Amino acid sequence: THVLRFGGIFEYVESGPMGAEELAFRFAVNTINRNRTLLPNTTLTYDTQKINLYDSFEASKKACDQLSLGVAAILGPSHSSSANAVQSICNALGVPHIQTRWKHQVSDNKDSFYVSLYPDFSSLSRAILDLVQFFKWKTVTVVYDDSTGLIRLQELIKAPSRYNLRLKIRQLPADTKDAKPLLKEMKRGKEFHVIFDCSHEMAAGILKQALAMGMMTEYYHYIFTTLDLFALDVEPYRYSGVNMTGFRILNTENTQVSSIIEKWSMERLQAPPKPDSGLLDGFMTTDAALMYDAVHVVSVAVQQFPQMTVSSLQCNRHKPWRFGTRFMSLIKEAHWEGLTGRITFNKTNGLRTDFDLDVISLKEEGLEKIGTWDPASGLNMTESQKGKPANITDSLSNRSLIVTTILEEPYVLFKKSDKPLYGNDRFEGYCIDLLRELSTILGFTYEIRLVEDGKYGAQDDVNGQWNGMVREL
Amino acid sequence: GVAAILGPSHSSSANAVQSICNALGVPHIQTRWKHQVSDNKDSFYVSLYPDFSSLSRAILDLVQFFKWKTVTVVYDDSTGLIRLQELIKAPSRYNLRLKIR
Amino acid sequence: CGIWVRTSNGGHFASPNYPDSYPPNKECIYILEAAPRQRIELTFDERYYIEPSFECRFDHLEVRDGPFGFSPLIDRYCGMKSPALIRSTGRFMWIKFSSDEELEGLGFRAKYSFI
Ligand SMILES: *[C@@H]1O[C@H](CO)[C@@H](O[C@@H]2O[C@H](CO)[C@@H](O[C@@H]3O[C@H](CO)[C@@H](O)[C@H](O)[C@@H]3O)[C@H](O)[C@H]2NC(C)=O)[C@H](O)[C@H]1NC(C)=O
Numbered sequence: 001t002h003v004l005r006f007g008g009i010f011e012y013v014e015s016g017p018m019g020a021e022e023l024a025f026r027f028a029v030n031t032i033n034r035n036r037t038l039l040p041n042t043t044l045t046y047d048t049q050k051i052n053l054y055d056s057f058e059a060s061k062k063a064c065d066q067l068s069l070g071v072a073a074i075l076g077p078s079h080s081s082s083a084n085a086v087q088s089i090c091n092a093l094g095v096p097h098i099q100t101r102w103k104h105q106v107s108d109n110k111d112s113f114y115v116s117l118y119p120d121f122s123s124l125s126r127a128i129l130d131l132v133q134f135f136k137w138k139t140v141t142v143v144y145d146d147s148t149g150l151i152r153l154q155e156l157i158k159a160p161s162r163y164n165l166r167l168k169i170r171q172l173p174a175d176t177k178d179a180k181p182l183l184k185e186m187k188r189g190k191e192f193h194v195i196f197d198c199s200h201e202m203a204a205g206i207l208k209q210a211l212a213m214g215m216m217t218e219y220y221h222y223i224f225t226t227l228d229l230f231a232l233d234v235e236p237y238r239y240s241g242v243n244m245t246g247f248r249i250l251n252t253e254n255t256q257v258s259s260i261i262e263k264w265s266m267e268r269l270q271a272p273p274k275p276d277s278g279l280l281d282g283f284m285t286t287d288a289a290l291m292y293d294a295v296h297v298v299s300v301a302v303q304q305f306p307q308m309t310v311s312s313l314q315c316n317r318h319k320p321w322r323f324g325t326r327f328m329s330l331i332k333e334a335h336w337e338g339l340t341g342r343i344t345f346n347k348t349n350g351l352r353t354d355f356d357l358d359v360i361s362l363k364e365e366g367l368e369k370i371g372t373w374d375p376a377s378g379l380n381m382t383e384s385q386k387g388k389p390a391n392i393t394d395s396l397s398n399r400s401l402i403v404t405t406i407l408e409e410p411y412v413l414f415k416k417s418d419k420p421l422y423g424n425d426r427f428e429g430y431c432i433d434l435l436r437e438l439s440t441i442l443g444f445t446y447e448i449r450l451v452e453d454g455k456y457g458a459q460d461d462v463n464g465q466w467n468g469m470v471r472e473l
Numbered sequence: 474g475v476a477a478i479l480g481p482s483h484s485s486s487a488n489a490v491q492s493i494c495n496a497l498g499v500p501h502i503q504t505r506w507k508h509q510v511s512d513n514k515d516s517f518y519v520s521l522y523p524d525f526s527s528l529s530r531a532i533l534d535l536v537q538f539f540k541w542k543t544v545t546v547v548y549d550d551s552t553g554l555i556r557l558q559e560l561i562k563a564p565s566r567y568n569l570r571l572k573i574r
Numbered sequence: 575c576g577i578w579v580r581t582s583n584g585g586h587f588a589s590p591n592y593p594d595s596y597p598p599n600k601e602c603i604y605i606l607e608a609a610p611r612q613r614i615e616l617t618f619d620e621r622y623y624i625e626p627s628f629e630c631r632f633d634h635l636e637v638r639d640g641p642f643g644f645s646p647l648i649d650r651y652c653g654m655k656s657p658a659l660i661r662s663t664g665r666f667m668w669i670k671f672s673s674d675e676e677l678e679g680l681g682f683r684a685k686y687s688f689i
C-alpha cells in the first residue's frame with residue numbers, strides 16, 4: 001500500500017453540489033481501492049483542486065500547488081483555454097498530463113506529455129461522412145453553435161471536393177432559445193437532412209423548438225454528431241417517426257458496464273437532476289465516463305512501474321522529473337476495457353484515433369443499436385430486418401393528417417341542410433366516400449379543409465411557382 | 474512593474490498573458506488575431522489586427538462584385554476556417570457553389 | 575383589417591391590433607387616394623428602434639404607386655427599423671401589409687397626410 005496521489009482539476013459551478021466529473025473521478029478511486037485485482041500492493045490517494053471557469057492563470061496557480069504536493073498525473077480540466085496552460089506546465093515539468101475534452105491542438109505544438117481520451121473529431125468527422133454517404137444523401141445542411149465547430153468538422157467540409165455533395169452551413173445564434181428564425185429559414189429552404197453539432201443539452205433545447213414549428217415529422221432526418229445522445233427525453237418524439245441518428249462510444253453491452261452505470265445512477269441522483277430541460281434523470285454522461293476510464297488507464301500504467309515515487313517538484317525548480325520519461329511511455333502503451341471499450345493511443349501524437357462506435361437510431365421503441373463503426377473497418381450495419389405487411393398497413397390509428405380538397409359538383413359538396421355543422425362532418429360527395437374507406441382500412445385521423453386559393457393548381461410561368469393544391473403540397 | 478505589455482504572436486502564448494494581465498490589471502495590447510473563446514469574460518486587452526469578422530465580410534463583398542458563381546477556398550491550417558467563417562456561410566443565402574481544399 | 579381612410583387631409587394608418595402583436599395569417603390591403611394635383615406625404619412611426627443585421631421575407635410592408643401588383647414596386651420594407659418618409663407625386667400610394675404563419679412582431683404605426 002504505497003502512497004500515490006492524483007491531480008484533480010474540475011472547472012465547476014463555484015456553488016451548489018459537485019459536478020458530474022469530479023464525482024466520477026472519486027468513484028474510480030473508491031472502486032480501485034476495493035477490488036484489489038488492480039494495485040493490491042499500492043493504495044492511491046487523491047487531491048482535487050477547484051477553479052473558476054476559463055481562467056488560465058488561475059489554473060496555473062493550482063497546477064503549481066498540486067505539483068508542490070507531488071502527484072503522478074494531472075487529469076486536466078475540461079475546457080481548452082485552461083487545458084493549454086496546464087499542459088504547458090506539465091510538459092515543462094515532466095509530469096504526465098491526461099485530457100478528456102477535445103481541444104484544438106496548436107498547429108505545431110511540440111508538447112510530448114499529453115494524451116486525450118476524447119475521440120478525435122478527425123475520426124468522428126470521417127465516420128459521419130461515411131454514414132452520410134451510406135444514407136445516399138446529396139443535400140445535407142450542417143448546423144453548429146460554437147466557432148470551433150468548423151475546425152471540428154473540417155474533415156467533413158472538405159469532402160464536397162471528393163464526393164458528390166452540396167452542403168450549406170448555418171450557425172445557431174448566440175442566444176439558445178430563439179432558434180426559431182433559423183428553423184423558419186431552414187424549413188423554407190426545404191432542408192431535409194440536417195446535421196446538428198452541439199452539446200446534447202443544446203440539442204434538447206432546439207428539439208422542442210423544432211417541434212413547435214412542426215418539423216418533427218416523417219420528412220426531416222437529423223443526425224446528431226454529439227455522443228451523449230441517450231440522455232435525450234425521447235418520449236414526445238418516438239411516436240412521430242423522424243429519423244434521428246447519433247453515435248455512442250459508451251459501450252453498454254457488457255454486464256459489468258450495466259452494473260457500474262447502475263450504481264452510478266444510485267450515487268448520482270444523490271445530486272438533483274433537471275425536471276424541465278428534457279434529459280433523463282440519472283444517466284452517466286460521456287464526460288464522466290472519460291473521467292472514470294482515465295483513472296483505470298493511469299492505474300494500468302502505474303502497476304507495472306513499482307519503482308515510481310512522488311517527488312515534490314517546484315515550478316521555480318525547472319529541473320524535470322526522474323520518472324517522467326519512462327512513465328509517459330508506459331501510459332502511451334496501455335490497453336484497457338473501460339466504460340468506453342477499447343483504449344489505445346496513436347503512437348505519433350499521443351492523441352486517440354482508434355476506437356469502436358455503436359451507431360444508433362430512433363426506432364419506434366426508442367434508441368436501439370443498428371450497427372457498428374470503427375476507423376479500421378468500414379461501417380458495418382445489421383438492420384437487415386424484414387417486415388411482412390400488416391393488413392392495416394401504416395397504422396392502427398397514428399399520425400393524424402390534414403387533407404385538402406375543393407368543391408366539385410359530383411365529388412365534394414358541403415353537406416346541405418339547415419343546421420350548421422363543423423369539422424370533417426359538414427361535407428359529402430364521392431371523394432369523401434373514397435377517403436372514408438381509406439380510414440376504415442388504414443386507421444386515419446383526418447382533418448379536412450379547403451384551399452383558400454381555390455384552384456386545381458398549376459405551374460406559374462412568372463416564377464416557376466404553383467398554386468392551389470400543388471403549391472400547398 | 475510595467476505600464477502595459479505588448480504581447481507575443483502565437484495564440485497559445487497570447488492567451489496566458491491575456492489572462493495574467495487581466496487578473497492583475499495591467500493593460501495588454503496585442504498584434505496578432507486569435508479566435509477569442511466566446512466564453513471568456515476578460516476585459517484588459519485590445520488587439521490591433523483587423524478582426525476577421527469584418528475582413529471576411531469585405532472579401533464577400535469583393536467576390537460578389539465579380540459576380541462569381543464558383544469560388545475555391547484554399548487555407549493553410551485549421552484556423553483558416555474560423556478566419557473565413559463569414560464567407561463559408563454564404564451559400565446559405567447567395568449563389569456560391571464553392572469548394573474547399 | 576380594412577380602415578377606409580378615404581378623403582382626409584390627414585389620418586391614422588396602422589397595423590391591426592397595433593399596441594399588441596399583429597395577428598398571424600393576415601393579408602389585408604390598405605389604399606391611400608389623393609385628389610387631383612395633390613401631393614401625398616406618408617408619415618410612419620416606428621414602435622421600436624433597433625438595428626437588425628439581416629433582411630428577410632415572411633413579413634413585408636411594401637409601397638406601391640398606383641394599383642396593387644400592377645404598378646411599379648417602390649420598396650419592400652420589413653424588420654423593426656423605421657422606413658424613411660416617402661414623398662412622391664404619383665397621387666396613389668397603395669400599401670399592402672402581409673403576414674406569415676407565425677412570428678408576429680411589434681407591428682407598426684403610420685400617418686398619411688395630403689397637400
Ligand atoms: C495516426 O494519425 C494519423 C494522422 O491522423 C492517421 O493517418 C490518417 O489515416 C487515415 C486512415 O488511413 C487517413 O484517411 C485517409 O484519407 C484519404 C483521403 O483521400 C482516403 O482516401 C483514405 O481512404 C483514408 O480515408 C488520413 O488521411 C491519415 N491522415 C493523414 C496522415 O493525413 C493514422 O491513421 C493514425 N493512426 C495510427 C495508429 O497511426
Ligand SMILES: *[C@@H]1O[C@H](CO)[C@@H](O[C@@H]2O[C@H](CO)[C@@H](O[C@@H]3O[C@H](CO)[C@@H](O)[C@H](O)[C@@H]3O)[C@H](O)[C@H]2NC(C)=O)[C@H](O)[C@H]1NC(C)=O
Pocket residue numbers: 524526527530625626627628
Ligand atoms: C462591433 O460593433 C458593431 C456595431 O457597431 C457590430 O456590428 C455588426 O456587425 C455585423 C457584421 O459582423 C453586421 O452584420 C452585417 O450588416 C451589414 C449591413 O446590414 C450587412 O451588409 C452584412 O451582410 C451583415 O449582415 C451588423 O449589422 C452590425 N451591427 C449590429 C447589428 O451590431 C460588430 O459585430 C461588433 N464587432 C464584433 C466583431 O463583435
Ligand SMILES: *[C@@H]1O[C@H](CO)[C@@H](O[C@@H]2O[C@H](CO)[C@@H](O[C@H]3O[C@H](CO)[C@@H](O)[C@H](O)[C@@H]3O)[C@H](O)[C@H]2NC(C)=O)[C@H](O)[C@H]1NC(C)=O
Pocket residue numbers: 218219220221243
Ligand atoms: C427514414 O428511414 C427510412 C428507413 O426505411 C428510409 O426509408 C427508405 O429507405 C430507402 C433507402 O434505399 C429508400 O429507397 C427506396 O426507394 C428507392 C427509389 O425508388 C428504391 O430504389 C429502393 O429500392 C427503395 O424502394 C426509400 O425511399 C425509403 N422509404 C421507404 C420507407 O421505403 C427513409 O429514406 C429515411 N428518411 C426519411 C426521409 O424519412
Ligand SMILES: *[C@@H]1O[C@H](CO)[C@@H](O)[C@H](O)[C@H]1NC(C)=O
Pocket residue numbers: 372380381382
Ligand atoms: C457486422 O456486425 C455483426 C455484429 O457485430 C457481426 O456479427 C458481423 O460479423 C459483422 N460483419 C462484418 C463486416 O464484420
Ligand SMILES: *[C@@H]1O[C@H](CO)[C@@H](O)[C@H](O)[C@H]1NC(C)=O
Pocket residue numbers: 239397398399400
Ligand atoms: C399511436 O399509437 C401508440 C401506440 O399504440 C399510442 O401510444 C399513441 O398514443 C398513438 N398516438 C396517436 C397519434 O394516436
